Design a protein around this ligand. Structure first.
Ligand SMILES: [Mg+2]
Ligand SMILES: [Mg+2]
Ligand SMILES: [Mg+2]
Ligand SMILES: [Mg+2]
Lengths: 58, 852
RNA sequence: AUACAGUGAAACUGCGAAGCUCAUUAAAUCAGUUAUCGUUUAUUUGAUAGUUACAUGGUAUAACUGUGGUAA
RNA sequence: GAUGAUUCAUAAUAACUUUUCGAAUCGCAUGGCCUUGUGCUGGCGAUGGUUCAUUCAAAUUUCUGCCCUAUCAACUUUCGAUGGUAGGAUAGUGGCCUACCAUGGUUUCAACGGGUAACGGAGAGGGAGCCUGAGAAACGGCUACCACAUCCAAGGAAGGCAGCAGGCAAUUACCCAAUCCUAAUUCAGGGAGGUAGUAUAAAUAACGAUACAGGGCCCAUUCGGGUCUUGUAAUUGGAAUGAGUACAAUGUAAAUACCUUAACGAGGAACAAUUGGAGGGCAAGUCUGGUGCCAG
């Protein structure tokens, strides 16, 4: 039954309607703003023990 | 009624439109309840999607059972008890009861390799392995969904800490699990990965943050439909080419048909492709083409007949495309051997003229004298000497897989090609047949497992010149930084992994996890002299084995699961039963890899010398923060060594490798009688003692091995060339030279011992031969004892022989080879060999007289 | 209730488990009647056994505790 | 000693035995004694146990008992038919079975065979073997064999539904109370059983008042003849009550139903039964045929 709600999932137009310590970790994760890929950008890695931090591969 | 985030529906629909796969990571205890919703969205987007589902788990399912009758009985009892109404079924129970789900353990991931599934569910995150992740994802078709259920609380705490701070790694109270942590970070880079909770809230850590629904709707299909239409009238080409699924597959089949048409029996076709690209379908279709063309004696060879089930399946589909009918035009013969599991062995065809397709073991090359075609499937897994015998005066098709199953190193395929440079035709299949080309998941998987890594020639080394080995220095590689998924570390990892795969014969996907998580393992890299990312020249992976590992082992047994093993310490235990060697600490060189182009320039020896120096002490906290990264590479002095007694190696005996370890002062102590089935060479263990430590034990072991080797030349090492056998003896004797002490010394044969071994009539027979008064056959009985006495060093300084003469005596006496067999091996005519053999026996007789 | 003592899951013992559908068969079915000095018989009922001990063993395990195998 | 009758009941001798049985059990109560030790001796029950009799059953067994038949005169020894001796088995008698022996047994007084309104004994997927019990060749279980069919990760596992009830479509819901039956039993149970579910007598009306009209009806082919309180397509009054709408009690294991019984309940009594038959008559209407205005 596509138009109807089968199981708990209903699709109208292009939007789907569904019926539904860790909890603190859940909400903290949901509120994160920067992506993991972006967080890598500000990071630099030291190649040798006293070498200069290299950020991006050439 | 909660409005789902628009990203989740859009991603599934985008994948279906573009035939790209997508990854969902569901975090929460109620993650299982969200799978039915995702599957429904997948099916509604396209009704042509495959409805089969794959459920992979380690030991236990999540709160349900896959046995139907057990489920209804629990349901019926619940209904009878009144806990549930008569007809209530929550969505999850409906999802399992109706849908076609295949439940598979992680251990038995081989069974799923052939099949194709619409959705893949990986129940357990902690137990994910590189092999299980390559095998399972490859079965998902275009538009499918890969679901990974990160339900564990500890897994979530790792997820939280990295997202809060990429440097920080959550580490519980000896396995580090670096592969899983690197896996999580990689998921962020994937554009088709969404990480969601059990409420379908999109966690922003995922890479698919900015997914937007695509507008409603490929060139490769266009280049494929036109080709089929053009060839429809031209049978048998049209019917068979119709079975092709991709442009590359059709081109390969047509090229095979060209070979089948040319009828040249000195012609060879080499097919190279990745796994899942459709080689076996191409092979089976072409075999059907040769059947319809007229080839009668068609052969198929592989390591085992079971692996050919797909190839034979597509032959029959090709036969169906050609109108052949089972039990009228052809008959199927299945194996009676229980080992082959009723695998098809022979197909007999009766149309027009009698035509036969037969499976042969690769060793049986003699039967191929009447062959018109042999199809070598998975030639990578057949030993190189054996396949060379298989290249006869007949049409040859070879299929070799690159980075599929174990496959083989890419350079090995190149070395095989270089040898073939017989007329050659090379064909390559690049496009996948289950999903769209350039699928992000396949790219993400290859990066994560470093499967597609390739070696690159460095122009800078050419300009500056090749570094002299004395200039190069050895540096330790910190594993936490290497597997931190930083772009710099990732590039260095790829270069290291490139060196690994090219050199060694066989590499499994799990080797990456073993290297990352195992505590005993360490990594060393021989960088060029520092003066950009450095390009390693040689990489050494060692594993600490001995008394040091016992503390880690004892922890594992307390866990209830023994972790890993001590190969050399256990091996030396059963062979010699020496309690001391168990207590001795040592390191085993798991793998030493060098650039094949720069081989013979002395890097491999240089790195071992520096490594030997390091553990001798001649060069005398970097862990990640546990809830800013340390340097990627560490100088040798910066990290103190463990106390070790010996350096060991385990490798498949080849003349090149044996010469390499012989030159580096390694002494052989064991050699396996049973050849490795995949590669065909014998595993050899060689040990090296470090200065300042007792060396008495190694000398005793080497002496015992030499006696074992001498007697076992006749049993299973008779295949070895005589020159190779002498080298092993010579390498062992170098061990005796290492010990300056004369406490142990060979004993010259006494007259009393001489009488027992040879009777006087024999000695008279030996004298008469030297006088040329006897034939060679008369003395055949005495030769093996003479070889034992001579190579036992009982004859002493009186009798010495040349390297060629020692080879001849060893071959007759020990290898049991014929005198003519030595002639071919030593490139000497038979008459000269017998003349030399007589001269050898004169010296032995003269010595026998002198004692008397 | 200083062995337990009310009630009592599970488990071990004891007792009882003894309408339909097809075919057809003339005093071989069935009915009445006779015999068992020619027999078996739970139960009911009535009779009926003077020929370490202030109480023996596990030669004993279940339910139960806990460790696991299996798709079941 | 007992029967009509016994090698019957019973007793004894000598041995035999996978020699049986002859309370290592439980509940309630705590009396009578004294030799004060918790010393001796104790009341009512339950569960067990040998043998006999009784009861409930079972198995064989004597004699008798309505069809047509000779166009059914032999049948039986056809792997026992009739009988004797011995053994095996059975709970026992017994050709029930086995060894030896005799040649018998039914029949024209109807054997044997045939037909039958002789509904006027068998099985639980199909044959074979076995197990429990006082009682079964068990609608139970087990083994192999033969088919059917189901789940599976294809390594195995399990079934008797090859059923039942329907059609050519609601067999369900409530109980053990009533009558009986089984148990470690007053109390548990029983799809035994019980309860419910889904051609026969009435009504659609009865009784009055007033007004206004002169015709109404019967017979007869024909002409005509016979007789008298009739018609309304008029107005009007107050009474009666059933269907319904329904408060209760009774009824019952409970409930439905039945019986009994408050209040309301009629003029279009619209609180609105039918079915069939025989005749008409009408237009600025339609069609057809003609010897105007007609006929169909
Ligand atoms: Mg009694
Ligand atoms: Mg007798
Ligand atoms: Mg009136
Ligand atoms: Mg009516």
């Amino acid at each position: 039954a596509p138009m109807s709600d089968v199981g708990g999932v209903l699709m109208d137009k292009d939007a789907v309607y569904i019926d539904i310590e860790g909890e603190k970790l859940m909400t903290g994760l949901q509120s994160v703003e920067q992506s993991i890929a972006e967080k890598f950008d500000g990071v630099g890695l030291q190649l040798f023990s006293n070498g200069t931090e290299l950020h991006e591969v050439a | 009624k909660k409005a789902i985030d628009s990203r989740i529906p859009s991603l599934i629909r985008n994948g279906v439109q573009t035939k790209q796969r997508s990854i969902f990571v569901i975090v929460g205890d109620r993650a299982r309840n969200q799978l039915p919703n995702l599957h429904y969205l997948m099916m509604s987007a396209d009704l042509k999607m495959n409805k089969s589902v794959l459920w992979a788990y380690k030991k236990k399912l999540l709160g349900f059972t896959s046995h139907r009758k057990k489920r209804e009985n629990k349901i019926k009892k619940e209904i009878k008890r009144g806990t549930r109404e008569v007809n209530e079924m929550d969505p999850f129970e409906s999802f399992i009861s109706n849908q076609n789900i295949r439940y598979v353990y992680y251990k038995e991931s081989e069974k799923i390799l052939g099949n194709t599934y619409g959705m893949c569910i990986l129940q357990d995150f902690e137990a994910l392995t590189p092999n299980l992740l390559a095998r399972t994802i490859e079965t998902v078709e275009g538009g499918g969904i890969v679901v990974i259920l990160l339900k564990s609380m500890s897994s979530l705490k790792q997820l939280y800490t990295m997202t809060m701070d990429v440097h920080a790694r959550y580490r519980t109270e000896d396995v580090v699990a670096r592969f899983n942590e690197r896996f999580i970070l990689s998921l962020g880079s994937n554009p088709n990965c969404l990480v969601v909770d059990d409420e379908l809230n999109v966690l922003p850590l995922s890479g698919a943050k900015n997914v937007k629904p695509l507008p409603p709707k490929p060139p490769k299909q266009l280049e494929l439909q036109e080709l089929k239409e053009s060839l429809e009238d031209v049978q048998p080409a049209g019917s068979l080419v119709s079975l092709s699924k991709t442009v590359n597959q059709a081109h390969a089949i047509l090229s095979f048909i060209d070979a089948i048409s040319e009828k040249t029996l000195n012609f060879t076709v080499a097919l190279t492709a990745g796994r899942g690209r459709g080689k076996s379908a191409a092979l089976g279709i072409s075999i059907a083409a040769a059947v319809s063309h007229g080839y009668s004696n068609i052969f198929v060879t592989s390591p085992s007949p079971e692996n050919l089930k797909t190839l034979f399946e597509f032959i029959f589909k090709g036969f169906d495309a050609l109108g052949y009918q089972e039990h009228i035009d052809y008959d199927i013969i299945q194996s009676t051997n229980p080992d082959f599991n009723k695998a098809i062995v022979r197909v007999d065809i009766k149309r027009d003229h009698r035509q036969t397709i037969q499976y042969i073991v690769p060793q049986d090359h003699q039967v191929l004298g009447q062959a018109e075609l042999v199809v070598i499937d998975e030639a990578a897994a057949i030993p190189l000497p054996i396949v060379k015998n298989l290249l006869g005066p007949y049409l040859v098709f070879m299929a070799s897989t690159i980075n599929g199953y174990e496959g083989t190193g890419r350079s090995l395929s190149l070395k095989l090609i270089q040898q073939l440079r017989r007329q050659l035709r090379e064909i390559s299949l690049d496009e996948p047949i289950r999903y769209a080309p350039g699928d992000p998941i396949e790219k993400w998987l290859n990066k994560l497992l470093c499967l597609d890594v390739t070696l690159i020639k460095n122009p800078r080394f050419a300009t500056r010149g090749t570094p002299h080995p004395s200039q190069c220095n050895l540096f330790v590689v910190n594993r936490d930084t290497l597997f931190s998924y930083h772009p710099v570390s990732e590039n260095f990892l790829e270069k290291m992994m490139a060196l690994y795969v090219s050199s060694h014969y066989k590499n499994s996907p799990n080797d990456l996890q073993l290297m990352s998580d195992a505590p005993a393992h360490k990594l060393f890299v021989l960088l060029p002299p520092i003066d950009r990312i450095p390009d390693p020249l040689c990489v050494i992976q060692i594993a600490l084995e001995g008394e040091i590992s016992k503390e880690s082992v004892r922890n594992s047994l307390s866990r209830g699961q023994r972790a890993g093993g001590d190969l050399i310490p256990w091996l030396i235990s059963q062979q010699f039963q020496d309690e001391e060697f168990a207590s001795l600490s040592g390191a085993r060189i798991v793998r030493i890899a060098t650039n094949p182009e720069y081989a013979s320039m002395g890097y491999g020896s240089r790195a071992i010398e520096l490594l030997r120096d390091y553990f001798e002490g001649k060069f005398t906290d970097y862990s990640i923060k546990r809830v800013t990264l340390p340097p990627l590479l560490l100088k040798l002095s910066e990290q103190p060594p463990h106390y070790l007694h010996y350096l060991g190696v385990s490798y498949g005996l080849t003349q090149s490798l044996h010469k390499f370890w012989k030159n580096n002062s390694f002494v052989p102590v064991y050699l396996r009688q049973t050849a490795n089935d995949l590669t065909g060479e014998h595993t050899c263990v060689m040990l090296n003692v470090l200065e300042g430590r007792e060396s008495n034990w190694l000398v005793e072991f080497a002496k015992d091995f030499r006696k074992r080797f001498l007697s076992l030349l006749s049993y299973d090492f008779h295949k070895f060339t005589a020159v190779q056998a002498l080298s092993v003896i010579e390498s062992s004797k170098k061990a005796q030279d290492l010990s300056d002490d004369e406490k142990h010394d060979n004993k010259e044969l006494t007259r009393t011992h001489l009488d027992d071994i040879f009777s006087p009539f024999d000695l008279k027979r030996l004298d008469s031969y030297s006088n040329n008064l006897l034939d060679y056959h008369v003395i055949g009985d005495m030769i093996p004892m003479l070889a034992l006495l001579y190579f036992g060093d009982k004859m002493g300084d009186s009798v010495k022989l040349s390297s060629v003469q020692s080879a001849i005596l060893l071959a007759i006496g020990l290898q049991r080879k014929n005198i003519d067999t030595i002639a071919k091996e030593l490139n000497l005519p038979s008459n000269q060999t017998i003349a030399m053999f007589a001269k050898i026996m004169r010296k032995m007789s003269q010595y026998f007289r002198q004692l008397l």
